[PDB]
Amino acid sequence: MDIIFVCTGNTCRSPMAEALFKSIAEREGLNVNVRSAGVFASPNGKATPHAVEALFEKHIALNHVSSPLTEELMESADLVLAMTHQHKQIIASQFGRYRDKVFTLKEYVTGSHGDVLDPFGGSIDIYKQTRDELEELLRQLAKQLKKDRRL
């Protein structure tokens, strides 16, 4: 299926999630298409240096250019996983009637209310904590996606 990760800038959390999940998915043998976008993103932007360094440590390349979320992306996605509950709210105010496909990453994976907080402006250690937080969620996501018919 088509999965999109969404954050604010599409510079830290969602690009990290996309790169981490693509790696996990290919190991697990998952047949999914993965993208990321931001609710307040510019195009041509890049992943922040700390996000790049955090993934580089785990031998994953984060070569990323920022993309704004658009109606076209929202229509075509099978699943939209937002970092925060506020991101869900923005998605609902700016785009079409797609509530049924939009969930926070924590909601969808763990069943509980929870946000993946913005690491932007934080130290490399803040980013590495975000990376680890994402990794654990995304490993579970992979296992869960196996339970989806027509995956």
Side-chain angles (χ1 to χ4, degrees):
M1 64 182 68
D2 278 27
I3 307 287
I4 183 161
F5 294 109
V6 175
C7 58
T8 302
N10 192 221
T11 60
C12 311
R13 276 163 305 178
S14 68
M16 278 192 288
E18 172 182 7
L20 291 169
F21 192 65
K22 282 170 167 176
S23 182
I24 284 163
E26 77 175 2
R27 304 275 209 266
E28 186 67 27
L30 274 181
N31 287 332
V32 297
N33 191 269
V34 184
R35 291 194 32 82
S36 64
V39 297
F40 294 120
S42 315
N44 202 19
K46 286 187 188 179
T48 63
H50 285 347
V52 167
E53 169 175 10
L55 295 208
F56 185 84
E57 162 180 335
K58 302 284 196 173
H59 306 260
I60 292 178
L62 181 53
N63 188 352
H64 172 76
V65 168
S66 299
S67 172
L69 187 65
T70 63
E71 171 71 24
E72 187 203 75
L73 294 174
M74 286 296 306
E75 183 280 326
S76 172
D78 296 304
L79 184 60
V80 181
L81 297 172
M83 297 304 142
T84 75
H85 277 88
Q86 185 61 254
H87 289 147
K88 289 179 46 178
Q89 292 306 320
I90 300 298
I91 303 307
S93 67
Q94 295 307 127
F95 304 104
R97 307 285 308 171
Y98 300 118
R99 283 184 184 270
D100 281 302
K101 75 174 65 176
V102 178
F103 301 95
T104 68
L105 178 57
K106 290 185 175 177
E107 260 190 326
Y108 193 83
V109 175
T110 81
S112 62
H113 208 103
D115 291 336
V116 176
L117 302 179
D118 200 343
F120 182 84
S123 69
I124 188 60
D125 300 294
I126 293 293
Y127 276 78
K128 293 183 192 191
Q129 295 177 261
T130 298
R131 176 198 71 203
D132 290 348
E133 174 182 18
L134 284 176
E135 190 173 355
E136 177 171 294
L137 287 163
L138 295 169
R139 291 192 182 279
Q140 305 173 66
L141 179 65
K143 306 294 189 189
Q144 285 169 0
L145 286 172
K146 309 300 279 285
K147 297 181 178 52
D148 198 304
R149 288 194 202 270
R150 291 178 49 187
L151 182 267

